[PDB]
Amino acid sequence: AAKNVVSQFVSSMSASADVLAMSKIEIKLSDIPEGKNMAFKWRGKPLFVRHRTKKEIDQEAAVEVSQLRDPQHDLERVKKPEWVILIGVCTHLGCVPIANAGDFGGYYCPCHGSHYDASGRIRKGPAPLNLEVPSYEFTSDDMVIVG
Amino acid sequence: TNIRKSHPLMKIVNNAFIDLPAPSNISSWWNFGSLLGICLILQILTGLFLAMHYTSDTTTAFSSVTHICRDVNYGWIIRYMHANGASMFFICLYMHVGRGLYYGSYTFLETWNIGVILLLTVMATAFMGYVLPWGQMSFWGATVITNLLSAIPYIGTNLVEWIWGGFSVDKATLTRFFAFHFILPFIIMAIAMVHLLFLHETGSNNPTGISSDVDKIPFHPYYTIKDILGALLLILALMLLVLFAPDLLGDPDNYTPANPLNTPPHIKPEWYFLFAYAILRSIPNKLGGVLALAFSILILALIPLLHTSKQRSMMFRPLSQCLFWALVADLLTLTWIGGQPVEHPYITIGQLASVLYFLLILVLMPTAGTIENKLLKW
Amino acid sequence: TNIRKSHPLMKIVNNAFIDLPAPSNISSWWNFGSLLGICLILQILTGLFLAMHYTSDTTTAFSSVTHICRDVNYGWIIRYMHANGASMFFICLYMHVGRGLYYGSYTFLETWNIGVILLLTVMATAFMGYVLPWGQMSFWGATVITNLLSAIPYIGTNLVEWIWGGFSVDKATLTRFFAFHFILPFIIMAIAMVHLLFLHETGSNNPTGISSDVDKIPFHPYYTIKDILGALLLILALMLLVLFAPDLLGDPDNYTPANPLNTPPHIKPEWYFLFAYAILRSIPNKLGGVLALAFSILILALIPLLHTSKQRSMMFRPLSQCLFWALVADLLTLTWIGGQPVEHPYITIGQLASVLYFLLILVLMPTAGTIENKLLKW
Amino acid sequence: DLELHPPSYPWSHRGLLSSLDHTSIRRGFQVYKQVCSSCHSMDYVAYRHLVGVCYTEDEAKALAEEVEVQDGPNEDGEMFMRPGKLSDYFPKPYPNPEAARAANNGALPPDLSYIVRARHGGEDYVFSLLTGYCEPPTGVSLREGLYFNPYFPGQAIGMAPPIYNEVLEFDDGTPATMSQVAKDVCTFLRWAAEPEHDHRKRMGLKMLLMMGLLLPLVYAMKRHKWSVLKSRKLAYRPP
Amino acid sequence: DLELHPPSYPWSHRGLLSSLDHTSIRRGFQVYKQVCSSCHSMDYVAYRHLVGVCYTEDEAKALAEEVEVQDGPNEDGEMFMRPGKLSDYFPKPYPNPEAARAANNGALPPDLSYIVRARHGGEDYVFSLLTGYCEPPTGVSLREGLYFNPYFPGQAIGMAPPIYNEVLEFDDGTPATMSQVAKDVCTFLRWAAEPEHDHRKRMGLKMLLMMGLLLPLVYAMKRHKWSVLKSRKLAYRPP
Ligand code: HEC
Ligand code: HEC
Ligand code: HEM
Ligand code: HEM
Ligand code: HEM
Ligand code: HEM
Ligand SMILES: CC1=NC2=C(CCCC2)C(=O)C1c1ccc(Oc2ccc(OC(F)(F)F)cc2)cc1
Ligand SMILES: CC1=NC2=C(CCCC2)C(=O)C1c1ccc(Oc2ccc(OC(F)(F)F)cc2)cc1
Ligand code: FES
């Protein structure tokens, strides 16, 4: 009995069904063309999914690993090479980076002076971490669930 | 020597809980104290867990309570435990008081009067609790009952608007009712501890109303095991309501949100106020009705002074026994009448029941005591 | 015989308040207990009055707090009394602990350990209090500090999301933080009473650290009149803040509403956590930093075991005195460093101060005690 | 102002341990969808609520996508209209109560989320109301638009008989008689008002059984400890 | 990312017991009205707030009537626009933050209600910002629209110099220089953020005086009671 009663009361404090409802967001991958970025509303934040070209894949592959402020290779930032999924919150003091711009040709911020590459990694600016890589999995080849 | 009698914290526990000398012969009517404690703790836990999800803002309030029942995990079972737990509290309270009356435990004056205070505090808590869902009966119940205080000359009208924090029961009233409703149970817990502190000055009364010093048994294990059995039966009653009829003791109109225009058909408080609600409606004058409703509870403080019998308990007192059971049946009548619309024959029955309530306490049961005495050459 | 020693309620008051044997010679550092009590009661009243106007819904929360300060009658003076009252509480707490450390009152083990618990409870209360306005520093402070628990292996990440009731500090977190923040002061009041219950087992320590049984004075009038004077000085300090610099001990960024995108420049907790916040940032590894932040408080429980000196008080102990004042100055350094950005030279100073904190408590002050002993042929 | 209270119909969930007929819920939903949802709101039921009750995840996604809902703002600062998803609630017919009154000649159609719980009689009441519409007795008539129902308080309602034979074709092919349509919609409105119903009763059974076990056990423990005292004999032996 | 913090200007309310210059507030309001209120919201200040502070009841009624505000619904179920009254708050320029960003090239103009309290330096900071706009130093330029201000963090702001000589004619005929316009608006924004200011300080004086009285009195009471013990002499008299 006491196991059940306690365990229910513990359950009370964990996320309600309506908070679990906003946990995940489904994105259709055929709705974003090769090269263009598409923004989404996720957990009250922007969420950038970007279809990357054969050029953007190879150009972000052979980048210098050491020179970066936050050393991460590209093939471990993503699950599929042609898709990079990121939270659209600038890591320094919280802005929304604008797509297809900046020095490093990816995301740029007119708040302080940050430049992200096509892989979402900070190259030249005041930001301390790269743009945040969320938890996600591809289900069927056409669809992605983020969360 | 042991570390139950030695340790400053265990000492209080050992004396008031384990080695407490208890009469050998105390009946089921002595379980209600323990059960009141369980009720209070049950309300506090369930209540606290509900307060993690509720909001006192008038727009979101009704929605939050329903959000608890539909989206919050086991929020429904918590919510309905808390609502039926409030009923279980009042069942326990009136049974507990009845015991006191019948067996004359009220002679323990301080214990008794602290009781009266506790009763009044639980009432205040439960009145303000029922407002929190912000349904029709919530809002309209609160409006009518609060606004009775306007019947006081000179100040009454100000007083009402000061409780409200406005010109009707609105935003500031709901928010403060949440704050008072949160704090009061904790004040209850304190006063309940003082209640027992005075009880342990004398120890317990018993069914005979004759002193039991000659035959005391230690509280453990005898009454620890009985209290567990009692607790078990309380949980059964509660869960029978919660899992089989959670709406039985409430009202449907509290499932539509509060509307300051649209008045419900027969506006009424929750069942445990109905007896005193009927007394209010008996008197034609409004201030008279308020003073009668107030005296219908406060008269409990007067009971010890009205005691006439040379015997303490009603066990050995046939006339008093009948008059007592009449007083119970009358209260059951007032509860029924309280739930009815103001019409024939419920007006006249209500008047007649309210007359009989005060007549039984202030005249008949005192007379019966003295008649019983003169029958025993006393 | 009198009805101060007789009456069950007055008896407790007479023994723990009036006829209490107190050492003749206790200094100003003994006032802080009474002042902590006043603080607690002050917070409860002001807090309750604020709760009559506040709402825990994320959208209305910031607005309700400001609505208090602008539209509610004297809501501003209540609000800023409560915020500065929290500061006054922590001033009182650290002074009270310092007294205990310097004069070796911690030898009263149970009293001391209950103290540690009280400290931790007031901390938990004040952390969750600062979240309630739902400003930037509120939201971002809560986010960073809570999320430290994710550093625990296996469970940590679940634990954090379970406190939150979601995937960030949001709707369910604010509502529950209001409920916990309401209940906890009442739990504090209970534990504070147990705190004194153990203190009145031994009576008070004094500045000499020598037993004072040979020269006790009754608490009334001597310390009733001193405590009144103390209370008066506490009210002055509080009201000097409230009426002349109510924003001095807070942060400006908590006057802009909470934004889950827009991060504040240098996110930090309120001043009374800054010392332990600096200790956290000293260790490069995150779980290490959390275990150090936790041990920076819990080490208080270890102090009595670390006691080496054959004398109880530091009064007659020059080396310990210096090391104590070094430990105070170091804590003042950690508070300063805690308030700074993570850069040169504040990283290195912070590391060096955090080393010195644990070094002073675990090595230097114990050694100093034993050196002092061997200087006295002991 | 005489009163005719509803009779107690033998519902498939009438008994203490009887669950809701979920296939009846599935039909009843469609009776809200096809008939009511242009007049009554049902604010507390979302499209996700249907999953694992009357519809699958995939079915409920299709039902959600079928309806309009406002959302915004976008980066431009405008409020657009989008296809619904599981997280969206069942949409209100009108933007507000005042608009609703205008569309129904003064009378406000109540939200149906809790209507079973908010009216005395519950599903027995609603079923009687929906099927009970009849021709008025002699000596009687209300305002042009207020119909005669013997189960409504004051004997006159402001709702046009909403159910009749074949007002909808059901997805599982059940013959849609007036009484079948009412039965189903009531069963849905019961679940609307009280989603917990089935879990509640599962817990009830498990409570009754555990209490069946623990009560006589604890009672036996009681009699065991007390047996020292129940047995005892006293003797008074003065000198 | 170097930093230039503002100097401490001698405000008429700088001192412990110094009240706000209410005529300066009256001017400063108009500097919000004429200049800011098309860009910044000030949600927590209503037209009633002005009464007994900088304007009369009748003046504040006129200022309220001057502006548009949405209200509804009416019995038809529509949302209309009406002339403002005292109960209405100062209206937001845009319907939402996302609309505001679009109008100001990405940057969101902060609400001004608490801006004195929400920025380090307060009125000293804002005054320096408003008057401190200058030509950039050599080696420097930002994006086309982001101006140079030495007092803003990161040295580059997203606000066009808003104040200059004679940007407004004041109601009392004060010569509207850039520094006079900034001084006044700061004094208003101080009152915006902290309406209690004048009452707070009135209470401060009365507290200081009562404490001036009670502290030495209570201290005298202390020494009085304790004087039995302070005076006492001990003597050890073994046999
Ligand atoms: C075109 C209008 C319209 C349609 C179609 C309609 N309703 Fe209603 N309904 C109303 C109005 C108007 C009222 C308010 C009546 C009154 O107050 O007199 C109402 C009232 C109700 C009530 C409240 C009765 C009470 O006790 O007060 C219930 C229950 C109800 N409707 C259920 C339904 C169900 C079930 C359906 C279809 C399966 C339905 N309605 C279809 C307009 C409609
Ligand atoms: C046409 C546009 C416009 C006008 C006119 C304008 N502002 Fe602003 N203001 C902005 C924008 C955009 C920002 C955000 C700047 C940024 O983040 O870089 C801003 C920011 C501010 C800030 C915040 C500075 C900080 O520390 O972050 C203050 C204070 C301010 N304005 C006050 C005023 C006052 C006072 C006036 C007039 C008396 C005024 N503004 C007129 C657009 C305007
Ligand atoms: C929250 C409400 C209350 C709690 C928690 C409480 C608690 C208790 C407890 C635990 C006991 C001892 C066990 C028992 O005999 O039942 C007791 C006894 C008593 N209580 Fe209460 N009580 C409450 C309310 C009241 C009220 C409302 C009254 C009277 C108006 C009252 C009067 C008494 C008396 C007279 C006794 C002594 C009984 C005897 O020895 O025979 N109590 N109470
Ligand atoms: C003597 C103790 C208490 C009594 C008698 C009591 C009574 C009630 C009642 C009758 C309701 C209305 C229930 C309903 O119709 O839904 C209610 C609601 C509520 N109570 Fe209590 N209560 C008590 C203690 C507490 C405590 C300690 C808390 C919080 C710490 C609390 C929090 C709530 C909340 C949040 C609600 C609204 C949710 C709901 O409606 O169930 N209560 N209370
Ligand atoms: C809400 C928090 C607290 C309250 C209300 C409180 C209350 C009191 C009071 C009234 C006294 C007696 C007067 C005095 O000597 O100051 C006292 C003594 C004491 N407290 Fe606390 N206290 C609190 C927190 C703490 C903490 C955090 C500690 C230690 C970590 C502590 C340890 C002690 C000790 C050791 C004494 C004995 C002092 C002596 O006899 O010299 N207390 N407390
Ligand atoms: C140890 C006792 C307490 C402490 C240390 C404490 C601390 C705090 C702090 C630091 C804040 C934030 C103040 C601010 O920045 O505005 C706060 C807010 C608040 N507290 Fe408490 N509190 C205590 C007791 C209480 C109690 C008992 C209640 C209610 C019964 C309460 C109700 C509130 C409310 C409603 C707020 C939000 C209003 C505001 O921000 O001032 N507090 N508390
Ligand atoms: C303390 C008690 N004294 C007595 C009797 C009858 C016989 C003699 C006196 C009791 O049954 C008794 C008692 C009271 C309460 C019990 O459970 C609790 C329930 C709640 C509780 O908390 C609090 F403080 F009451 F709020 C504390 C204990 C268990 C036993
Ligand atoms: C109870 C007390 N005992 C002692 C000393 C010093 C000397 C000896 C021991 C005290 O100053 C002392 C005391 C403690 C608190 C005082 O005021 C209160 C403040 C708060 C309060 O409530 C509660 F319970 F603490 F929460 C109760 C009393 C007044 C006096
Ligand atoms: S705020 Fe965009 S990088 Fe500093």
Side-chain angles (χ1 to χ4, degrees), chain C residues 23-26 62-63 65-67 69-71 74 76-77 79-80 215 217 221-223 225-226 228-229 232-233 235-236 239-247 251-253 255-257 259 261 343, chain E residues 1 16-17 44-45 48-49 89 101 108 110-111 113-115 117-120 190-197 199-201 203-205 207-208 211 214-215 218-219 221-222 225-229 232:
Chain C
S24 64
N25 69 313
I26 49 162
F62 186 96
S63 313
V65 171
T66 64
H67 162 263
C69 305
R70 309 167 153 276
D71 289 329
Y74 303 97
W76 63 270
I77 193 165
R79 191 270 169 106
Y80 294 111
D215 194 12
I217 62 179
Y222 295 108
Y223 299 109
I225 202 55
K226 253 185 82 210
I228 289 164
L229 180 58
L232 205 58
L233 286 156
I235 296 155
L236 168 85
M239 297 326 295
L240 280 170
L241 293 170
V242 174
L243 310 173
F244 294 118
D247 293 325
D251 195 278
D253 268 291
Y255 280 114
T256 41
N259 191 330
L261 313 172
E343 258 155 313
Chain E
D1 57 87
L16 285 189
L17 306 179
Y44 304 100
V45 191
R48 68 177 161 86
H49 274 71
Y89 292 90
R101 289 192 201 277
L108 167 49
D111 186 276
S113 303
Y114 267 106
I115 207 57
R117 259 170 154 166
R119 294 291 180 281
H120 286 272
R190 175 54 164 192
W191 172 85
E194 196 184 24
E196 70 261 38
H197 188 276
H199 204 173
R200 184 176 64 81
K201 288 184 175 184
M203 293 208 199
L205 169 64
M207 177 274 289
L208 284 175
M211 286 290 145
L214 285 158
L215 280 158
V218 167
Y219 181 41
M221 283 177 77
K222 189 267 170 203
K225 278 311 226 300
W226 273 88
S227 67
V228 177
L229 293 177
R232 95 188 152 164

Side-chain angles (χ1 to χ4, degrees), chain C residues 185-204:
Chain C
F186 303 113
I187 293 151
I188 292 161
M189 199 170 73
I191 302 161
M193 285 183 196
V194 178
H195 186 62
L196 288 156
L197 189 268
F198 279 105
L199 181 63
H200 290 78
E201 271 283 297
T202 60
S204 262

Side-chain angles (χ1 to χ4, degrees), chain B residues 24 62 66 70-71 74 76-77 80 215 217 221-223 226 229 232-233 239 242-244 247 252 255, chain D residues 16 44 48-49 89 113-114 117-118 120 192 195-196 199-200 203-204 207-208 218 222 225-226 229 232:
Chain B
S24 64
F62 186 96
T66 64
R70 309 167 153 276
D71 289 329
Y74 303 97
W76 63 270
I77 193 165
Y80 294 111
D215 194 12
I217 62 179
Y222 295 108
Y223 299 109
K226 253 185 82 210
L229 180 58
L232 205 58
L233 286 156
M239 297 326 295
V242 174
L243 310 173
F244 294 118
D247 293 325
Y255 280 114
Chain D
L16 285 189
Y44 304 100
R48 68 177 161 86
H49 274 71
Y89 292 90
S113 303
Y114 267 106
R117 259 170 154 166
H120 286 272
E196 70 261 38
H199 204 173
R200 184 176 64 81
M203 293 208 199
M207 177 274 289
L208 284 175
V218 167
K222 189 267 170 203
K225 278 311 226 300
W226 273 88
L229 292 177
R232 95 188 152 164

